[PDB]
Design a protein around this ligand. Sequence first.
Ligand code: SF4
Ligand code: F3S
Length: 106
Amino acid sequence: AFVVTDNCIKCKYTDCVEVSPVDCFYEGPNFLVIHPDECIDCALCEPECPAQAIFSEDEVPEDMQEFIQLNAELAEVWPNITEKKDPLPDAEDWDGVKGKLQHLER
Ligand code: SF4
Ligand code: F3S
């Protein structure tokens, strides 16, 4: 399973969803998560995230380990997304800000 981590919060470019062969991504207000039972680890998405937020589960940084379980839990409540859409409005101002998990909306 690939894991979407912090920097996607408040950026949500959705460039990642075009490349996906299965419907692995599930959509929230300002973040996207990958459903771990459905990702087939094709690795195609992580070169596409402008925010460089997608990691192989085995490569999620020490300080971002929360995300592995977050992606699994939210993937069970959030709707599947399959079309790219426009990035959230202020996406570049937040790209690269650390500590964005305090801003996650459900
Ligand atoms: S690695 Fe592939 S199957 Fe997995 S979330 Fe990315 S695009 Fe989807
Ligand atoms: S910022 Fe998020 S919506 Fe996808 S393209 Fe990157 S993981």
